[PDB]
Structures are given as C-alpha cells and as structure tokens.
Amino acid sequence: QMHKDGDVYKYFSRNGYNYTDQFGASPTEGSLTPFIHNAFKADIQICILDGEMMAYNPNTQTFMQKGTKF
DNA sequence: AAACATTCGTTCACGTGAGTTCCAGTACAAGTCTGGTC
C-alpha cells in the first residue's frame, strides 16, 4: 500500500512493515518511484493506493510469477 | 307390588400440545506449527 503527499511517498506491507527504503521515498531514489512519479494526473497530490508488487520481464513483456524466486 | 334394564353425573387412566432447561452440532476467528526461496 502506497501513501503519497506531494513529493513524499511511503510504502507499507501486509503486516505493516515499512518498505520505503526499497521502493523510494522521493523521485530522486528508489526502484519504482522515479518512474511512477509522473504517471499521476495534475490535480492529484494526496493519494492512498492498495495493490500488488510484481516482477516484470520486458524482453518477453510478461509478469514473472514470484513462486519463490527472483 | 317387586325385579330388571337404562341413564346420568362421577371417577380414573392414558394420550397429546406448549413452555422451560440443558447439551451437542455448527460457524467463525485467532493462535500455533510448518514450508519454500531470496
């Protein structure tokens, strides 16, 4: 689950553990935020979202199911 | 005028429906143990 306020991002797991270190707390750093920051529309500054985090292979353009690996 | 049959209000036993308490079956939620990898 992702919390967004302006340029500030925060991520939480199923049981409540912080994961912002991995996914980035600002567009300058991270593994997802620098690329998803510009996806949001002009009028949206505060947001809470819930979803799944997955691994994507661009070569085959396919989701790699995280059975137990990668 | 006397004897026998019938009828009536009473009595007991037995059966059936509704209320109450107790326990078993069911459901759901949380806890505990386990598995696999990166």
Side-chain angles (χ1 to χ4, degrees):
Chain A
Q1 68 189 237
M2 160 192 127
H3 305 250
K4 175 199 194 283
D5 182 70
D7 226 337
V8 188
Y9 285 99
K10 206 163 259 183
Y11 295 69
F12 288 111
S13 87
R14 168 159 170 177
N15 287 302
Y17 293 108
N18 206 343
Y19 276 63
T20 321
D21 299 0
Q22 186 175 175
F23 300 117
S26 171
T28 43
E29 78 248 40
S31 83
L32 185 65
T33 296
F35 327 89
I36 71 165
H37 183 292
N38 303 289
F40 307 89
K41 312 231 182 203
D43 318 62
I44 302 313
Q45 89 179 252
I46 275 159
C47 197
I48 286 169
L49 296 177
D50 187 317
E52 263 256 8
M53 217 67 80
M54 301 215 78
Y56 193 56
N57 195 15
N59 314 0
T60 327
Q61 303 173 358
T62 46
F63 282 141
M64 294 294 176
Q65 291 182 358
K66 167 241 173 221
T68 55
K69 308 205 168 217
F70 63 72

